[PDB]
Design a protein around this ligand. Sequence first.
Ligand SMILES: OC[C@H]1O[C@H](O[C@H]2[C@H](O)[C@@H](O)[C@@H](O[C@H]3[C@H](O)[C@@H](O)[C@@H](O[C@H]4[C@H](O)[C@@H](O)[C@@H](O)O[C@@H]4CO)O[C@@H]3CO)O[C@@H]2CO)[C@H](O)[C@@H](O)[C@@H]1O
Ligand SMILES: [Ca+2]
Ligand SMILES: [Ca+2]
Ligand SMILES: [Ca+2]
Length: 545
Amino acid sequence: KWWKEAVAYQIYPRSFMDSNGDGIGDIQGVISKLDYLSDLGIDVIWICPIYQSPNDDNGYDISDYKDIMKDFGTMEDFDELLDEVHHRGMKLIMDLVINHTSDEHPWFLESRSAKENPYRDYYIWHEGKDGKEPNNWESIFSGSAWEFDEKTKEYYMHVFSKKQPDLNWENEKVRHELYEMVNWWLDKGIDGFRVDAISHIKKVAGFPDLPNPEKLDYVPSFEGHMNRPGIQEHLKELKEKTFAKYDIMTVGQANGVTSDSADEWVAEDGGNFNMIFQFEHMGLWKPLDLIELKTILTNWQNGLEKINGWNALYLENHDQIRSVNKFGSTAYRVESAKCLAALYFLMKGTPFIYQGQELGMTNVKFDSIDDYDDVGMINYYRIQREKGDSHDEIMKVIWETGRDNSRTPMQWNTEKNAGFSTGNPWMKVNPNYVDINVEEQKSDKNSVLNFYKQLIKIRKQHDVLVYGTYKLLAEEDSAIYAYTRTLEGKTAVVICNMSPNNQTFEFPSSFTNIEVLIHNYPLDKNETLEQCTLHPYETRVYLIS
Ligand SMILES: OC[C@H]1O[C@H](O[C@H]2[C@H](O)[C@@H](O)[C@@H](O[C@H]3[C@H](O)[C@@H](O)[C@@H](O[C@H]4[C@H](O)[C@@H](O)[C@@H](O)O[C@@H]4CO)O[C@@H]3CO)O[C@@H]2CO)[C@H](O)[C@@H](O)[C@@H]1O
Ligand SMILES: [Ca+2]
Ligand SMILES: [Ca+2]
Ligand SMILES: [Ca+2]
């Protein structure tokens, strides 16, 4: 329940704050900015992986689950971070990455050392077929999902990068070691987990070839490992052996789950997580099809209400482009950032703010593939360029869809590197930091940052915005996304002009009192309540008694 009322903030530590001048964010950097997060009103901090890692996938390739990444500091630094977070009235959830390890993890170093050894079946090994890979599956990061090991003459599976071999969840030995490791972290007093790639742990037994109608070199392989039948047996055991023993919050990153199939994931009785990140609204690749977005988010609002589930509300993370670009407008950056904020944040669920979302940070356009880092897009570039795609064609995909857009340094001020670092940042700062930065937004009462501050405040002050039932209004309006939250004798009306144009809208009205809780445009003195004349990306929230 505390997690129902929480507002969460997601830190990408490599890009949050560099405290010692090597261009890489670190834990002491996070500590130095906890005032910022406390003042914002954040309740829960989710920090991306901070464990020992070769950083082939920036922390998601872990070589020691119980040791801190050298780039980020030491276990003392972590203990200090957790102690400071907890003394400032906040909680911290860690990133739990147990679909795969680094290929430099001691388990894998042993697993690959000999065809027979005690760790061989900790991972997924198979001999080739027809002198090629065991099957035609493609890695999510492009290329084959199998990597050949010359020494033992077999392939190992990697859904993600070649340096992220998948763990074998069919091996009871593996599961036992993972549960011990999870509880070791929970025994330290962390407040839960965001659970990485968790819908990928069940592979179709025997790893059969997938249909290949377009005769590709490798076949996108989601039907072989994403949310496959049999996964719930493993997730139920994970919950029983770890999470259920502690008063924590869990949010599973669960691609491949739909609003109709969310029951076993988040239902109040028997769900294996408190909430999940679902992906149905994040793949609508021009004028946004607003009504399609209404349909998806409404499906999840209504769907989880019926099974007493809880939604995780978000538009940004370290795997997506920036939401102004994805859902708003760079022609109305500040206005659409605030409009999007009210839109997603005030639905029923637990809202997550990704670092820089509260500033209206936007996508970046670097010309050189060497300026980027994302293993997925570097791989994509190589494979597609050999296939004849031009540099411009590939950079368009990277610019418009690549997750590096969300990994540029946090923009603190207008000093060198936006104040993120005294050194040369591991990823270049967006040049628009001269216009978009924390320092400037603190002093502007109409900044995106202070709009998020107000959103957090009104959600905390009005129970209807936490527990109120959601209802979509004006479904057929292709520009206005409007909805209500209803609880006892209070109704909140959220009105978002999700368009770059002025629009008219009849107030969807039965009240003894009306109060405007938040608005991103000055109120027009002559304007009547009944006939809204909304500016581009104007949002208003009314509270009705
Ligand atoms: O630790 C390895 C990585 O794991 C985590 O991210 C993973 C997800 O768990 C995977 O499910 C997957 O998600 C991708 C997906 O591959 C890609 O197709 C795209 O998904 C679209 C989807 O196709 C579309 O139908 C709609 O639902 O929108 C989706 C989102 O746009 O994007 C997904 C998210 O990137 O791969 C990712 C890694 O890319 C972890 O968080 C990663 O940081 C980590 O590398
Ligand atoms: Ca550093
Ligand atoms: Ca089994
Ligand atoms: Ca007006």
